[PDB]
């Protein structure tokens, strides 16, 4: 069985942990619970092939930027998450992609832009903006809500499919 | 700064930030439960960086602050009936129903060990640990 090492990055409060726990345990809670380092393993069937996802959920803040450097080096694919009601988290995506490119010495890194909290009405980043960012980066964009589970499988499946394409 | 690095069953890990007065159990319950692991099925150990003994078991009620800066490991108790699933593809010629969504299942997947059967797009909702009392 192929294992896929995934890393979830993005600013604080955007729902990285909620997205991961929804995927892993089919469960959503409203509680904010600060992440330092958390890895999860879960079997998933993707396009008829069982694979093992090894998912690392990270802290967004600058304090742990040297930890993130090491996490990213061995990561094979990256979920770059922003909250669709937080424009700063959207623009901060750029810092996380720059950080990833530094430890990969490549622009060809499997990556999906994830716009989370799509259940909320207070939306400040619209679908068109994010598609344009993802287009300029050459990566897919997926809308999600960790609260409703909308698009959660789609984000992780799309990232696995990006890794598979890259390993061709 | 008041953190403990904790290796967890099935090659997982967490870094816990310790709130004074909490036990190891208080600090690790959520980490285990979110990974589909029952605390009652596990033991917690202090890793020993010395020979003739890799780890030493600790009481779950041990004060967590007292172990700050050490590396701990949580392992399954001996012979607990928990394993990882062994998924195989399966075409159901007879009418069958998904264990996740209860809809018709024609082409799906099935755990050869516990018999869980499901649609591909239902696989992430299959519980993480396979329960085998066979
Ligand atoms: N409405 C809504 N709330 C969400 C969604 N995803 C996460 N949240 C909420 O947003 C807050 C932060 O979620 P969390 O997953 O901890 O964010 P994080 O990206 O892990 N932050 P950190 O880097 O500090 O660990 C929580 O209150 C959580 O319930 C979503 O899709 N919709
Ligand atoms: Cl049906
Ligand atoms: Mg988090
Ligand atoms: Zn910035
Ligand atoms: Zn099973
Ligand atoms: Zn189903």
Author numbering:
A (entry chain A): 1 to 168
B (entry chain B): 55 to 188
Quote what the paper states about this structure.
The interaction of membrane-bound active RAS with RAF is the first step in the activation of this pathway. The N-terminal CR1 region contains the RAS-binding domain (RBD) and the cysteine-rich domain (CRD), the CR2 region contains a 14-3-3 recognition site, whereas the C-terminal CR3 region includes the kinase domain and a second binding site for 14-3-3 proteins. Here, we present crystal structures of wild-type and oncogenic mutants of KRAS in complex with the RBD and CRD of RAF1.
To understand if oncogenic mutations at G12, G13, and Q61 positions in KRAS have any effect on KRAS-RBDCRD interaction interfaces, and to identify any druggable pockets at the KRAS-RBDCRD interface, we attempted to crystallize and solve the structures of G12C/D/V, G13D, and Q61L/R mutants of KRAS in complex with RAF1(RBDCRD). We were able to obtain well-diffracting crystals of G12V, G13D, and Q61R mutants of KRAS complexed with RAF1(RBDCRD) and solved their structures in the resolution range between 2.11–2.87 Å. Since the mutant structures belong to the same crystal form as the WT KRAS-RBDCRD structure obtained in crystal form II, we used this structure to examine any structural changes in KRAS and at KRAS-RBDCRD interfaces. Structural superposition of WT KRAS-RBDCRD with all three mutant structures shows similar interaction interfaces, suggesting that the two RAS-binding domains of RAF1 bind to oncogenic KRAS mutants similarly to WT KRAS. A closer examination of the switch regions of KRAS shows minor conformational changes in the structures of oncogenic mutants complexed with RBDCRD when compared with WT KRAS-RBDCRD structure. The presence of a larger side chain at G12, G13, or Q61 position results in local rearrangement of side chains of some of the neighboring residues present in the switch regions without perturbing interactions at KRAS-RBDCRD interfaces. In the KRAS G13D-RBDCRD structure, the side chain of Y32 is disordered, suggesting multiple rotameric conformations of this residue to avoid a steric clash with the side chain of D13. These results suggest that RAF1 does not differentiate between WT and oncogenic mutants of active KRAS.
